[PDB]
Amino acid sequence: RAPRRQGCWKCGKTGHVMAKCPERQAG
Ligand SMILES: [Zn+2]
């Protein structure tokens, strides 16, 4: 899943997305 949304689809930053961001729930 390439970073097509340019960064997370919630934080708004590259280098990681909503799947790799530091806060993606992950329960
Ligand atoms: Zn991020």
Short mmCIF file of N, CA, C and O and ligand atoms in Angstrom, two decimals, residues 8 11 13 16 21-22, ligand 1:
data_model
loop_
_atom_site.label_atom_id
_atom_site.label_comp_id
_atom_site.label_asym_id
_atom_site.label_seq_id
_atom_site.Cartn_x
_atom_site.Cartn_y
_atom_site.Cartn_z
N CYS A 8 -0.09 10.16 6.50
CA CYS A 8 -1.28 9.49 7.10
C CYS A 8 -2.56 10.15 6.60
O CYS A 8 -2.56 11.28 6.16
N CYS A 11 -3.10 12.38 10.30
CA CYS A 11 -2.10 13.31 10.88
C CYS A 11 -1.70 14.35 9.83
O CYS A 11 -1.58 15.52 10.11
N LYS A 13 1.07 13.89 7.49
CA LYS A 13 2.55 13.97 7.38
C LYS A 13 3.12 12.75 6.65
O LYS A 13 2.59 11.65 6.74
N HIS A 16 5.22 8.18 7.00
CA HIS A 16 4.33 7.21 7.69
C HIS A 16 2.89 7.59 7.41
O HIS A 16 2.58 8.74 7.16
N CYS A 21 1.64 5.38 11.05
CA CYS A 21 1.77 6.52 12.01
C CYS A 21 2.00 5.99 13.42
O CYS A 21 1.84 4.81 13.68
N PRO A 22 2.38 6.88 14.29
CA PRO A 22 2.66 6.50 15.70
C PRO A 22 1.35 6.32 16.48
O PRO A 22 1.35 5.79 17.58
ZN ZN B 1 1.94 10.65 10.35
#
